[PDB]
Amino acid sequence: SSRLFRTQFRMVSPKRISNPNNTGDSRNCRAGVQINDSGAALGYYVSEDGYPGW
Amino acid sequence: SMYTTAQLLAANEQKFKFDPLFLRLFFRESYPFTTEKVYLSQIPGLVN
Numbered sequence A: 001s002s003r004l005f006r007t008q009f010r011m012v013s014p015k016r017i018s019n020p021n022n023t024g025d026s027r028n029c030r031a032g033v034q035i036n037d038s039g040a041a042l043g044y045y046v047s048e049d050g051y052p053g054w
Numbered sequence B: 001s002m003y004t005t006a007q008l009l010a011a012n013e014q015k016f017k018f019d020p021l022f023l024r025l026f027f028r029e030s031y032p033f034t035t036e037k038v039y040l041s042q043i044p045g046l047v048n
Helices: B021-025
Strands: A033-035 A041-044
Touching: none
Parallel strands: none
Antiparallel strands: A033 A041
16 A cells, blocks of 8 residues: 555454364354354354355 | 271373374365265266
8 A cells, every 4th residue: 555544444244254174163153253252253264255156 | 996007199082193184185175064965976078
Protein backbone atom coordinates (compact mmCIF):
# COMPACT_ATOMS: atom_id res chain seq x y z
CA SER A 1 0.00 0.00 0.00
CA SER A 2 1.11 3.42 -0.97
CA ARG A 3 -1.87 4.78 0.76
CA LEU A 4 -1.86 5.97 4.36
CA PHE A 5 -3.64 2.98 5.96
CA ARG A 6 -2.49 -0.62 5.48
CA THR A 7 -5.43 -2.30 7.24
CA GLN A 8 -7.85 -4.28 5.08
CA PHE A 9 -10.65 -6.65 6.08
CA ARG A 10 -11.74 -9.74 4.17
CA MET A 11 -15.08 -11.48 4.61
CA VAL A 12 -14.97 -15.26 5.06
CA SER A 13 -17.83 -17.63 4.38
CA PRO A 14 -18.52 -20.09 7.22
CA LYS A 15 -18.35 -22.93 4.70
CA ARG A 16 -14.58 -22.54 4.34
CA ILE A 17 -13.78 -23.08 8.03
CA SER A 18 -13.61 -26.83 8.68
CA ASN A 19 -11.21 -29.58 9.73
CA PRO A 20 -8.11 -30.03 7.55
CA ASN A 21 -8.64 -32.74 4.92
CA ASN A 22 -12.12 -33.49 6.35
CA THR A 23 -10.81 -35.58 9.23
CA GLY A 24 -12.84 -36.67 12.21
CA ASP A 25 -13.23 -34.34 15.16
CA SER A 26 -10.64 -34.68 17.92
CA ARG A 27 -10.98 -33.46 21.49
CA ASN A 28 -9.32 -30.09 20.91
CA CYS A 29 -10.09 -29.47 17.21
CA ARG A 30 -13.84 -29.42 16.51
CA ALA A 31 -14.97 -28.30 13.04
CA GLY A 32 -11.76 -26.48 12.17
CA VAL A 33 -11.78 -24.48 15.42
CA GLN A 34 -8.86 -25.30 17.71
CA ILE A 35 -9.64 -25.25 21.43
CA ASN A 36 -7.40 -25.02 24.50
CA ASP A 37 -8.14 -26.70 27.84
CA SER A 38 -10.90 -24.14 28.48
CA GLY A 39 -13.69 -23.33 26.04
CA ALA A 40 -11.71 -20.62 24.24
CA ALA A 41 -10.59 -20.74 20.60
CA LEU A 42 -6.99 -20.20 19.48
CA GLY A 43 -6.99 -20.55 15.70
CA TYR A 44 -8.99 -21.72 12.73
CA TYR A 45 -8.22 -23.81 9.64
CA VAL A 46 -9.31 -21.92 6.51
CA SER A 47 -9.22 -23.73 3.17
CA GLU A 48 -9.24 -22.32 -0.37
CA ASP A 49 -12.26 -22.58 -2.65
CA GLY A 50 -11.66 -23.68 -6.21
CA TYR A 51 -14.29 -22.74 -8.77
CA PRO A 52 -12.55 -24.76 -11.56
CA GLY A 53 -13.82 -27.76 -9.64
CA TRP A 54 -11.30 -29.49 -7.36
CA SER B 1 -1.34 -62.20 66.53
CA MET B 2 1.97 -61.46 64.79
CA TYR B 3 4.53 -59.22 66.48
CA THR B 4 6.75 -58.39 63.52
CA THR B 5 6.89 -54.97 61.86
CA ALA B 6 7.97 -53.84 58.41
CA GLN B 7 8.42 -50.68 56.35
CA LEU B 8 8.09 -50.31 52.57
CA LEU B 9 10.61 -48.04 50.83
CA ALA B 10 10.56 -48.42 47.04
CA ALA B 11 7.68 -49.37 44.76
CA ASN B 12 8.29 -49.56 41.01
CA GLU B 13 6.13 -50.52 38.04
CA GLN B 14 8.25 -51.80 35.16
CA LYS B 15 6.96 -50.89 31.69
CA PHE B 16 8.04 -52.49 28.44
CA LYS B 17 9.21 -50.12 25.71
CA PHE B 18 6.52 -49.16 23.20
CA ASP B 19 6.21 -46.27 20.76
CA PRO B 20 3.81 -46.09 17.79
CA LEU B 21 6.22 -44.65 15.23
CA PHE B 22 4.37 -45.77 12.10
CA LEU B 23 1.12 -44.17 13.23
CA ARG B 24 2.96 -40.97 14.14
CA LEU B 25 4.82 -40.64 10.84
CA PHE B 26 2.46 -41.82 8.08
CA PHE B 27 -1.18 -42.26 9.16
CA ARG B 28 -1.90 -38.76 10.47
CA GLU B 29 -5.69 -38.55 9.98
CA SER B 30 -8.85 -40.44 10.95
CA TYR B 31 -12.07 -40.97 8.97
CA PRO B 32 -14.87 -42.48 11.09
CA PHE B 33 -17.46 -44.00 8.74
CA THR B 34 -20.93 -45.12 9.80
CA THR B 35 -21.61 -47.32 6.76
CA GLU B 36 -21.08 -51.03 6.20
CA LYS B 37 -18.17 -50.85 3.73
CA VAL B 38 -15.44 -48.48 2.52
CA TYR B 39 -14.50 -47.73 -1.10
CA LEU B 40 -11.00 -46.77 -2.22
CA SER B 41 -10.47 -45.83 -5.86
CA GLN B 42 -7.61 -45.31 -8.31
CA ILE B 43 -7.30 -43.69 -11.74
CA PRO B 44 -4.76 -44.78 -14.39
CA GLY B 45 -3.73 -41.36 -15.68
CA LEU B 46 -1.62 -42.36 -18.71
CA VAL B 47 -2.14 -39.93 -21.61
CA ASN B 48 -0.51 -40.67 -24.95
